[PDB]
Amino acid sequence: RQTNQLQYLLRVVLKTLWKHQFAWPFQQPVDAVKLNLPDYYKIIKTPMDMGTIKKRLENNYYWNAQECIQDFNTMFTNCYIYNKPGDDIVLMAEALEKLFLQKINELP
Numbered sequence: 001r002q003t004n005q006l007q008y009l010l011r012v013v014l015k016t017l018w019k020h021q022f023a024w025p026f027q028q029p030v031d032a033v034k035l036n037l038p039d040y041y042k043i044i045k046t047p048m049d050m051g052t053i054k055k056r057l058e059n060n061y062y063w064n065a066q067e068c069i070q071d072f073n074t075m076f077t078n079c080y081i082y083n084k085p086g087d088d089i090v091l092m093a094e095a096l097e098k099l100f101l102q103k104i105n106e107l108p
């Protein structure tokens, strides 16, 4: 059978990452005012999170699977930009990114 890559990203990849123990800080936009991070939007030009990716997948926002993959990568790299090598959130992001690349590699 054929695989619809955007449906794979929603039903397999996003669903797998969503259930991970480290997923919750990434399930919605970084609320920088509530988290007392007033420079967040100075450093992070294109915020991204899994709640936004889920909504874009559901609303047929993406042209193709690659545009969706680009948003997962922006979410991970924003974390690496704002924070420092070795910080807890970076460790959490690295673990989720490794799982994300595993799931993309598993595409049937």
Ligand SMILES: COc1cc2c(cc1-c1c(C)noc1C)[nH]c1nc(C)nc(Nc3cc(C4CC4)nn3C)c12
Binding pocket: 024, 025, 026, 029, 030, 031, 035, 037, 078, 079, 082, 083, 088, 089, 092
């Ligand atoms: C420390 O970075 C975050 C924390 C929270 C978050 C997003 C981020 C975040 C940043 C900054 N850059 O990319 C991401 C991703 N969203 C939350 N929502 C709530 C209600 N509480 C939070 N508390 C939280 C979680 C963590 C974990 C150990 C790293 N530590 N603390 C202070 C965060």
